[PDB]
Paper text:
Botulinum neurotoxins (BoNT) cause the potentially fatal neuroparalytic disease botulism that arises due to proteolysis of a SNARE protein. The HC is responsible for neuronal specificity by targeting both a protein and ganglioside receptor at the neuromuscular junction. Here we present the crystal structures of two BoNT cell binding domains, HC/A4 and HC/A5, in a complex with the oligosaccharide of ganglioside, [name] and GM1b, respectively.
Furthermore, HC/A4 displays no water-mediated interactions with the ganglioside, while both HC/A1 and HC/A3 have at least two each. Therefore, upon ganglioside binding, the two subdomains appear to rotate apart like an opening hinge. Upon [name] binding, these residues shift to form a hydrogen bonding interaction with Sia5.
Residue numbers in the entry: 877 to 1233, 1236 to 1277, 1282 to 1302
The structure:
């Protein structure tokens, strides 16, 4: 509540332009090469060209010398995977608030997010969040990250990642820090010509936010009633997704045969994608693609929301089939099939999409019969040496990471894969 009262700058897209949602009406000038996402116009893409800039000029009325002695900043960022060795040891600024090399800045490097304070004598202080690109599945590479930095010139600068304290360093051993009236959003000194960032909801606060305020800010801007894909964008209808099971990520979905005599199952291992000394990850663009189809969502847009009731279509050899099961089979594990859409009949197929209950959970798909009864969340079961996909009320009772925990993965420009 008093988090909006501490705002001195709050950038959002509104009615065909970026505007300040604080009461101080900062001037905001865009370059010719700034882009906005058509599904979420608050997502701002800046590329590595001189004309891809956002310059903010704060009104002189709100600029005073000690305005950055006690203040915080928050924003979301999505950083595409580094793939070129020119990016190693190439620190580059993305948010600059400095005059004569004094002030504060946010910068990036290979697997790093960096906050830097710098007085007029060139005494720097940095706090850093580090993530590796040598990792099977990363929570950070090309996925939306919530960043918060808090500053108290008596004590410490602190960087938080997804509401969690990462690094903290004292900033009391610092001289005079200039207070610029300008914040420059721009990739400054990046040698990767194809580098870009995506940001949203940049905020400036006139106080050092607590852990509690940071957590609550992370949760509100997380939109917990909307389902997310793997990258943290809104999950969507009529969109193709590769499936990743969070209990067994070194697997991908395959279909034995279409029809009621067949089944879907987790097959492994995944291939690796690599560039020597830059990254080594599991391939994400593998296996049978899922498509979510509207059944009873009345909302006109294509966004999947908590409790939406849907059909799941399954792509096999460029043809769509219907995920379904005969719930009358014996046992609580109901093996799933991929049926010709005309042949579904009265078999169970209606799926309740879940993001939370208000406890958020990664188990996304609760299959129902045609009388409103739970058949179970969609996961898998080890039958001998084959892990077949099932719906099972066992999951519903347990509801940690379970076999029903899934991520939906679309092809994204920030994660490029090329086989052979
Ligand atoms: C361990 C097991 O068999 N779990 C069954 C569950 O077992 C019931 C009791 O809880 C068991 O103690 C008891 O044991 C008997 C055996 O059934 C019997 O054949 C044997 O001869 O004697 C034992 C008695 O000493 O059995 C009863 C049932 O008879 O029964 C339920 C039925 O509701 C489940 O089938 C269950 O297996 C679990 O099934 C769900 C789907 O319904 C799911 O597949 C669970 O699997 C995962 C998961 O998706 O989370 C995935 C992994 O394959 C699985 N195992 C391993 C080794 O990694 C893990 C873990 O089991 C754990 O749940 C972590 O998530 O979970 C699957 O376990």
């Amino acid at each position: 509540k008093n988090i909006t009262n501490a705002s001195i700058l709050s950038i959002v897209y509104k009615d065909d332009d970026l505007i300040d949602l604080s009461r101080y009406g900062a001037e905001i000038y865009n370059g010719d090469k700034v882009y906005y996402n058509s599904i979420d116009k608050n997502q701002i893409r800046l590329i590595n060209l001189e004309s891809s800039t956002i310059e903010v000029i704060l009104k002189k009325a709100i600029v005073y010398n000690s305005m950055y002695e006690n203040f915080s900043t928050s924003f979301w960022i999505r950083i595409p995977k580094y793939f070129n060795s020119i990016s190693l040891n190439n620190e580059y600024t993305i948010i600059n608030c400095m005059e004569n090399n004094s002030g504060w800045k946010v910068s990036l490097n290979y697997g790093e997010i960096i906050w830097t304070f710098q007085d007029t004598q060139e005494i720097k202080q940095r706090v850093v969040f580090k993530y590796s690109q040598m990792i099977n599945i990363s929570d950070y590479i090309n996925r939306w990250i919530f960043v918060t930095i808090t500053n108290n010139r008596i004590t410490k600068s602190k960087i938080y990642i997804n509401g969690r304290l990462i690094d903290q360093k004292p900033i009391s051993n610092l001289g005079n820090i200039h207070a610029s009236n300008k914040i420059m959003f721009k990739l400054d000194g990046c040698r990767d010509p194809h580098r870009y960032i995506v940001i949203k909801y940049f905020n400036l606060f006139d106080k050092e936010l607590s852990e509690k305020e940071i957590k609550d800010l992370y949760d509100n801007q997380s939109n917990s009633g909307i389902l997310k894909d793997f990258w943290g964008d809104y999950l969507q209808y009529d969109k193709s997704y590769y499936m990743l099971n969070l209990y067994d990520p070194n697997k991908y979905v395959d279909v034995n045969n279409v029809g009621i005599r067949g089944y879907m199952y987790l097959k492994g291992p995944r291939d690796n994608v690599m560039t020597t000394n830059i990254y080594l990850n599991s391939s994400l663009y593998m296996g049978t693609k899922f498509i979510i189809k509207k059944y009873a969502s009345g909302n006109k847009d294509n966004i999947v929301r908590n409790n939406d009731r849907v059909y799941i279509n399954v792509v096999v050899k460029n043809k769509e089939y219907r995920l379904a099961t005969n719930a009358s089979q014996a046992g609580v594990e109901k093996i799933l099939s991929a049926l010709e859409i005309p042949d579904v009949g009265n078999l169970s197929q209606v799926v309740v999409m879940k993001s939370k209950n208000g406890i958020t959970n990664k188990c996304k798909m609760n299959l129902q019969d045609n009388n409103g009864n739970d058949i179970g969340f969609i996961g898998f079961h080890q039958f001998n040496n084959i892990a077949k996909l099932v719906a099972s009320n066992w999951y519903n009772r347990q509801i940690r990471t379970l076999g029903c925990s899934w991520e939906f993965i679309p092809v994204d420009d920030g994660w490029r894969e090329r086989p052979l």
